[PDB]
Amino acid sequence: MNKVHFVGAGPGDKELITLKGYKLLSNADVVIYAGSLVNPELLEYCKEDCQIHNSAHMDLQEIIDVMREGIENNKSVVRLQTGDFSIYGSIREQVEDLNKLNIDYDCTPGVSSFLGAASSLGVEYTVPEISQSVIITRMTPVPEKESIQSYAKHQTSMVIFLSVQEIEKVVSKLLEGGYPKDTPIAVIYKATWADEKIVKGTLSDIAVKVKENNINKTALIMVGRFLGE
Amino acid sequence: MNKVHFVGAGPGDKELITLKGYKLLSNADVVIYAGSLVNPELLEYCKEDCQIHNSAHMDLQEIIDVMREGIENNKSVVRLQTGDFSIYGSIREQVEDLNKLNIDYDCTPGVSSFLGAASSLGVEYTVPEISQSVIITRMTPVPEKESIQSYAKHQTSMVIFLSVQEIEKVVSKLLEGGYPKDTPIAVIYKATWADEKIVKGTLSDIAVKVKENNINKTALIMVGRFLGE
């Protein structure tokens, strides 16, 4: 067909889009991107006469109209979403709405920010005799068997998306599920963007280190012995 | 400098390498790739007069010699590793060995196969009111607090890398940690490669479905209610 193309933008760096992503983007007639969550530098890969829409200022129905009209005028349509949409992506709404209308689409994965964060930190989640797993979660209430404390019990590597002001709740949940105070932890803002910042520490001292970096906005926290390497 | 470039190849599809990855690869004088784990089609992006080495037939020290000699003749050196090396990547050996020699390097992340698997399945690990987390693990013995049964207790979404013949041990561990028999599950071989295959089912019937697909080799298993969407 001329499918609507859902494209993972990667974690911030211009060049961390997939080759496939880049081809579709650089050929798109209509692009719908996520506001300030997607790096604007990406948009420079688009055609001179491309029509850009910023979903951040749009309701669902407007995105869809924009999509449908792209299809009906035989225009290549790309919806750029941050990192990958299989982890915190809200792509279901748009898909169901397109089924409703009988519009073919496809999906092109991207590099998750937690992958970006690791490379950026030159670190490996899975490290022999230390951990063979990762738990990925994020921090208004949460069922017990899915809480940070509960996941902490495994003492494996963890990735936690948070709002940063909530640092003290999460540290205390980590200690509560039994991570020791010296457990290494890192907090990364805008992993792989030009402005990325990394605050390294342990469970006791990072609350302070985060406040004293003042750095606001959402972050990844990475927790575990795997930071010891 | 002229750093040794560690590059994530992505999950199999030629075009799912990052743009950055592609530039480095298409300019490399020396490439060291992982045997049959990396798709050979990628190698076609290399210069006519590029020197290819297949780590699969090499010990550590040979890789390093090959690296060092690239640097000393001012040759761009790319080590291509499958998916991303922060999850099951064994990049530590090569890095420590390069520190030893004082050789600058850098790291370029790629699309993990479990991301490839999701897009390929058009599915989302995190789905509102169903799960806000993912546990990523793999299946010769394993400590209790890090076993599949133990992780199963959270009833969240799981990704498990296995050898496929081991399907029955893992199903029984899943049920044991309390996933119900009707829990959807999928097994994917070579996610995003031309030959990828998807066996969809539930916990009771998938052991059979896998045997009767005969399909050998390593797979991803994906488990959870999140497959119900």
Secondary structure of B143-189 in HEC code, one letter for each residue:
CHHHCHHHHHCCCCEEEEEECCCCHHHHHHHHHHCCCCCCCEEEEEE
Element (H, E) at B135: strand B134-138
The domain locations on chain B are 1-111, 112-229
Considering only CB atoms, A86 lies closest to which of B10, B115, B135, namely: B115
Alpha helices in chain A (DSSP H): 19-27, 60-72, 91-101, 113-121, 148-152, 167-176, 206-212
SS3 B48: coil
Tell me the chain A residues in contact with residue B220 when contact means C-beta distances shorter than 8 Å: none
Tell me if A91 and B124 make a contact (CB, 8 A cut-off).
yes
Of 2.40.37.10, 3.40.1010.10, 3.30.470.20, 3.30.465.10, the CATH number of B1-111 is 3.40.1010.10
Q: Would an 8 Å CB–CB cutoff place B184 in contact with chain A?
A: no
Q: Residue A150 region, left (φ>0) first, then alpha (ψ -120 to 50), else beta?
A: alpha
- Can you tell me the distance from the alpha carbon of A180 to that of A170, in angstroms, rounded to the nearest whole number? 14
Q: For residue A132, what is the nearest residue in chain B, using CA coordinates?
A: B137
How distant, in Å, are the alpha carbons of A86, A225, B159 from that of B156?
Answer: 14, 23, 10
Q: Which residues, at least 6 apart from A103, have a Cβ–Cβ distance to it below 8 Å?
A: A4, A67, A68, A71
Distance from CA of B178 to the nearest CA of A (A): 12
Contact A133, A204 (CB under 8 A): no
Does the CB of B27 have a partner CB in chain A at under 8 Å?
A: no
For domain A112-229, the CATH superfamily is Tetrapyrrole methylase, C-terminal domain (3.30.950.10)
Among chain A residues, CA nearest to B137: A133
Residue type at B176? E
Q: Residue A72 and residue B228: Cα distance in Å, rounded?
A: 31
Same fold: A1-111 with A112-229: no
**B-interface mutation test, from A5, A17, A19, A120, most B Cβ less than 10 A away:** A19
Distances from the Cα of B185 to the Cα of A29, A132, B151, B177, angstroms: 38, 21, 16, 15
Judge contact between A21 and A110, C-beta under 8 A.
Answer: yes
B15 touches chain A (CB under 8 A): yes
A143 touches chain B (CB under 8 A): no
Report yes or no: A76 at the B interface, CB cutoff 8 Å: no
Token digits of residue A193: 């963007």
- Interface check for B88 against chain A (CB to CB < 8 A): the answer is yes
